[PDB]
Amino acid sequence: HNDYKYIIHPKNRWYKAWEMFILVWAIYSSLFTPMEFGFFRGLPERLFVLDIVGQIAFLVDIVLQFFVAYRDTQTYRTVYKPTRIAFRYLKSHFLMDFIGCFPWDLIYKASGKHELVRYLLWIRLFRVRKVVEFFQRLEKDTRINYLFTRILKLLFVEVYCTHTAACIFYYLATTLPPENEGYTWIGSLKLGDYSYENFREIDLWKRYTTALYFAIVTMATVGYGDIHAVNLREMIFVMIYVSFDMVLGAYLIGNITALIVKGSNTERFRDKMNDLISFMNRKKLGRDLRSQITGHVRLQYDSHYTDTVMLQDIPASIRAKIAQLLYLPYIKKVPLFKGCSTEFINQIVIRLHEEYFLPGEVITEQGNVVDHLYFVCEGLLEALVTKTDGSEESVTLLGPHTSFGDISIICNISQPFTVRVCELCHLLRLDKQSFSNILEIYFHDGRTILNNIMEEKESNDRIK
């Protein structure tokens, strides 16, 4: 697969860093071309090399995009064929990328300073495709929300349209002799004691700030009126800008509303809390029970262990593989199942359910018919084994990689001790009948379990 090594991968870190550098210079060029257009009729000598240092970079970019492997979405596969990738480029995003790299400033300053030449400077706006592609890659990225990478896209479109609008606004003023500059928006503008007359002589940044401020109050349609369109060209551009901006701000509100509607885990949890509060109130559950249920609901939304509800959709076989990738580590260190077959542990793992328990919760009361066998995964439990007068008696202090609830099922007796939760515990659960059925399938393994119970029985006095 090393054939055509002459073509650099489209993942090669060097070419990715080149894309980042091109992205930065694309942002600069696409934000400077409008300002190189309106605010100068010919780049002053100060920026002489700057624009050159621009074009050369994109020149290199052009060349690189002829030697970059392209993923054929038709095959969904990274195609490396030099003719395929090169011809593809040449018939898609090449013409603009080439015409944008001419010395348009130098061409204009050489061609007798003919204004219509500068209107080819806007060809350089096609370098915004780098920014658009960056936003496409971010949208493809799953770390970022789908809408927030659209909200950022529309924010960038707002910013870019505002900047180009300011530059075109000032250009409308420049398209009018100083004698008629009183008919221009900035020429007629005289905010405060200072007058914005002779905008041609005014510092470009002052005009840029003024134009941007005007475009800004148009963008949010706050629109004080201090700076307004006076000519007809200015009234036409303000009309176009205001209409497009109305639509685009409506799309901004739409995307923010979509993001907000999507749902917050805080909000989803609050809704299920409301439903369960209604449920407890209607059934007049005791305050203690209410507290327990609410506590576990909050724990469910916080531990996000509820997200195992997503597992329900993933098939049972794949779900079992997930269980064998996650629960199996904990199970193979369980002393209860010391030395059982891979198949037996496979079944036990297959029928496991996670459950996090809040501190101060009794798991099973002493004597309660054990309906669920509990492996400890994290946290600390207390086997208080409360008695008639030996209440809160000495405990085994069930820690990680230990198991309880089993003694009773294996001894076919009543729950030998009460279990109280000391810290947040990742208790794994096996239904009692499921355990018994797996034991019916696996006899000799069950005998081994009995043997381990005896081995620790001789030592551990409580299970003794």
Added chain:
Amino acid sequence: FVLDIVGQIAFLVDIVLQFFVAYRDTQTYRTVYKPTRIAFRYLKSHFLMDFIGCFPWDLIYKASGKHELVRYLLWIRLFRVRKVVEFFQRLEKDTRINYLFTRILKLLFVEVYCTHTAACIFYYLATTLPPENEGYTWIGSLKLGDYSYENFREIDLWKRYTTALYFAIVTMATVGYGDIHAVNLREMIFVMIYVSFDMVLGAYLIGNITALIVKGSNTERFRDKMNDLISFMNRKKLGRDLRSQITGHVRLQYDSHYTDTVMLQDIPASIRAKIAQLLYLPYIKKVPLFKGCSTEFINQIVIRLHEEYFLP
């Protein structure tokens, strides 16, 4: 002056209290009473800012020969909005008030805050210019009606503040009345930043309100279903008594709202079993079919029961 001094006192005492207040461990969910861990938690976060902000910055400024760069550190006292943020989060984590309604109040408080501070920064930017370049400020050139805001640093505090806040509020709703507008380049830049920020903030406000309305009430969904069926009942012109029966079935489905039985399924099996054993167990203990049966029988069938209400 006194109001400043006592001010920091309320915020110094609080710091002391934060060194002696218990918190729930994020891993063991237990109220950690240990003073060492409490103090280390404060020191790690929310200490440096609270203390720095408590320094008497006004007296430091007046004692440093009136250095404005010192006064720029007053904004550290804005990190005292953590208290409001925490209060809003706690209110959001109480079932009494809707989540999105709490967010609407959050955004409303944020708008209040951003307009107030925007007004204060706007007037500050007016005061940056020397008192002789007043004509080039936003307030120095104001001439509302017959009153000219000349020598703007000599008007009553509340006239200046209400003027600036007038600007801020009127631009926060994008009214842009134009009565007050930016004149300086610093004011233009600030207005641009503000306006652009409140654009997104108002969009988020409309988003929250729209989401709160789109996530309609269960009453609203009942009205949707009931009106759909009423439209049906009118299309086919169904009889009044039967009309009442269908309305009764819909009203049963909702006024019962035992659908929350599906919701208890989001509970560990132990507490779900306790729900069953406190709710349905008394009825099942009386059923004759399970006469004199083991407690185990009931205790494990009740978990499998499903509530169902039926009309005559």
Added chain:
Amino acid sequence: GEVITEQGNVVDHLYFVCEGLLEALVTKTDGSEESVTLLGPHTSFGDISIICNISQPFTVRVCELCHLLRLDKQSFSNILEIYFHDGRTILNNIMEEKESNDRIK
């Protein structure tokens, strides 16, 4: 690679394989899997389990990208009661070459 039916459960879904290939794996008490047969286009599984109301005789795993057509046992039973002659034909089909190898009594 997925599994349609697991041995030991009562199959209430008669799946007819239309496209792709599956595999029949029998799991034993020792824990071993035997590849009894491969189910390709225009094949079926679940009919014996539904007819005799037994647990699934063998795990049915997937080999190639599979397109099957599931049919509910309830609906199937209703239809077989619709056409008692074609139901007897179904019995004859299951007992014709497979016969009572799966304890058909």
